[PDB]
Structures are given as C-alpha cells and as structure tokens.
C-alpha cells in the first residue's frame, strides 16, 4: 500500500456523501446500492461511517461526467480512464467523478460501478495506488469475479494505517497476495507459455521469462476473465500454440487470450471415469504427443495426438515415479527432467536415469 504525502487523513469519523447525478445505464436504486456497498467495504474495517445526504454540500461529492466535465482533468470517452478521485481535503478533496462514456453495470459487463467506486473511494480516504497486483488499490482495473467481494489485505493494512480498526469486521480473514519467497509456498499449476514459465497460485500466476530473475505477478482474470480464480492443473501444447487449464471437472483450451470453440468441456471426454473429480497436475510431452494427468495417487497417460487414453492406465504414482510421495500438486518438464511439486518441496525427476536427481524448495523456481 501507499498513502499520500503528509498522510492526508480525514480528522472526522462520521463522513458525508452525495450522489449529484446518475448513470443512464443503471437505475437510481441499483446505483445507490453500489456506492453504499462501496463505502461498506471501507467502513467494515475502520472506525469510519458514511451518511448519504440528499442535497447541498457533502464531504464526498459523487458525480458523472463526460470528456471535459468541469475539472482541469477530462475523461477520455469509452474505456481508458474509468474515474478519478481527490485525496481527503476541503472542497474538491474527497470528491470522485466517474466517466459517463462507460457502460456502468452491476455485472461482469461494461465496468462494474461498485468495483470502480470501492477503488476510487479509497483515494478519497487517503490511499494512494498500490504496487501489489492483489490489492484493490492497484492502478489497473480488473473484474474481480462474480463471487462475493472481499477486500484484499494490502488494502485493509493501508486504510488501518490511517484510521482502523473498527469494532467488528464481519469477516476478518482478508486475501493476502502470495509471497514468492516464502519457503512454505506451494504451487497450484505450472506451464510453459510461449517460452515463459507460468506459475499458478490462487487467483494469480507468476510469469517468469527465461531471461529474467524476478517474475511478474498477474491476476488470472486479468488475462482470462472467464477462467476461475483457483486453477487445479495446466499444460501446454507448444507446437500447436495452446495451453490447457483444469479446474474441478471442467477443462479449457486457450489460444493466447481466448477460449477455443466450445470450451470448457468435461474431463470425462478426456476418458477419465466419474469418480475422478479433479486433475491435480498435468504435463505434456511434445516429443511423444502424450500427456500425463495426475489425480490422487494415480496417473493417466492420454494421447494428445490421437485423442484417447493409453491402455494400461491408471497406474499408481508410486510405481511409475517412486519417492515423491503419493500426490502431485503441479508438474512441468524441461529437457528430460520432470519437476514434481509436493507441498513446499520440489523433486527433480530424471527420465534418463529414471530417478530423482536433486531435491529443492518449490519456490526456487521463483529464483528465491
């Protein structure tokens, strides 16, 4: 998190707001419910408290504008700048204006008025932009998800640096964004994508280019709004330029930024039984056209080329790769070496000598 210079703080807990005008794309009530939801976010974790006025002059003055709309800073038509806010202060201070060239909705369409407000209200309460991609106060918009909204920990920490906490936060457990260097870090799925390493953990993935040491951290819905937050497993078909992604019984094929025709499919179509309710980890071998799919203590070998499970499967992980425990969280392969992630550990399995070369902390893929 970041606060503003001089630590611009409201000195009163009971504040006021006023919705000057409204977006055509929404109903007055749908709009009032949003902003009210948006302050609730901040109020739930601070001594703060918000009261809507219906006339005159409030602390936070909320209006909708187009292009040049009053203040020296103009809006930019559709997309681009979504809104802006001023830090706590006397007049323009606390205000937030929203772009009216936008399709405001309370859904996954247009731009979510409640999401954009929650963010922009933060500025109004003294929070500057955060560098954490996990934070609400991150400079770039991303539709969080359909699921019920939780305020990220970075934000809770930042706002409480100013005011908080309050008496009863209705759900104390706020999502921390993963730590690349925590030696207890365990991974969800791993894949190559266009030469780079993709490492999934929660609602994020790291992308780590062979030539970099610090990976970048994306939110998964930043790339693929449609995919879930947590991923079970992932693998690539490189030559065919494509990445497969698993969660529960659904699985997606993706070419760069878009889902393929008629995905997701059920894993049953892959030949798996019905009692198998998730793929834990998966790796494709371009050499041979086959894909390993791990589930529980078992492993399937599917023929990615000819679309059929190999015969003699499933087999037990403990037979075909002994000594890596009986589960596989994530796996990828590189140049004859398979990397098997079991909790905070990673095993380097040599196909060549058919055994474990070395053993190392899972996060050492993240240059830790």
């Amino acid at each position: 998190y970041n606060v503003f210079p001089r630590t611009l703080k409201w000195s009163k807990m009971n504040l006021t707001y006023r919705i000057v005008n409204y977006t055509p794309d929404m109903t007055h009530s749908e709009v009032e419910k949003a902003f009210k939801k948006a302050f609730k976010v901040w109020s739930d974790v601070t001594p703060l408290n918000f009261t809507r006025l219906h006339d005159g002059i409030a602390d936070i003055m909320i209006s909708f504008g187009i292009k040049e709309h009053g203040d020296f800073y103009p809006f930019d038509g559709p997309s681009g700048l979504l809104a802006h806010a001023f830090p706590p202060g006397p007049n323009y201070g606390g205000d937030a204006h929203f772009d009216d060239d936008e399709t405001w909705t309370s859904s996954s369409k247009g731009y979510n008025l409640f999401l954009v407000a929650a963010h922009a209200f933060g500025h109004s309460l003294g929070l500057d932009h955060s560098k954490d991609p996990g934070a609400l106060m991150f400079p770039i918009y991303t539709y969080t998800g359909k699921s019920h909204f939780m305020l990220p920990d970075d934000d809770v920490q930042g706002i409480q640096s100013l005011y908080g906490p309050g008496d009863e936060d209705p759900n104390p457990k706020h999502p921390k964004t993963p730590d690349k260097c925590d030696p207890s870090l365990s991974l969800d799925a791993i894949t190559s994508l266009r030469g780079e390493t993709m490492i999934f953990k929660d609602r994020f993935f790291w992308r780590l280019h062979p030539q970099q040491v610090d990976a970048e951290l994306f939110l998964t819905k930043s790339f693929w709004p449609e995919l879930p937050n947590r991923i079970d497993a992932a693998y690539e078909h490189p030559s065919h330029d494509l990445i497969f992604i698993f969660r529960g019984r659904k699985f997606w094929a993706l070419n760069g930024y878009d889902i393929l025709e008629g995905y997701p499919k059920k894993i049953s179509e892959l030949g798996l039984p019905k009692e198998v309710k998730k793929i834990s980890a998966a790796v494709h071998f371009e050499d041979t056209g086959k894909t390993l799919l791990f589930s529980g203590n078992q492993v399937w070998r599917y023929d990615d080329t000819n679309h059929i499970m190999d015969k003699d499967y499933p087999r037990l992980i403990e037979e075909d790769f002994p000594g890596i425990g009986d589960k596989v969280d994530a796996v990828y392969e590189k140049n004859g070496y398979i990397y098997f992630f079991n909790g905070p550990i990673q095993f380097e399995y040599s196909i060549w000598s058919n055994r474990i070369v070395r053993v190392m902390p899972a996060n050492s893929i993240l240059w830790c």
């Binding site: 700048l81 802006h84 830090p87 878009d258």
Partner: peptide, 26 residues
C-alpha cells in the same frame, strides 16, 4: 498577508485505468 490558499489544489488526484486492449488475437 500574503493572502492565498497555499493548498489551493491537489495534483495528488489519481485515476483508475482500464486498457483498450482487445480480444480474438490468435
């Protein structure tokens, strides 16, 4: 004197931003 609001305005206004980037790229 002198008479002027030393904190007349704030440059510290900040905007949220969504890129105009586009789907269907192959």
């Amino acid at each position: 004197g002198g008479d002027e609001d030393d904190l007349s305005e704030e440059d510290l206004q900040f905007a949220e931003r969504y890129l105009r980037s586009y789907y269907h790229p192959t």
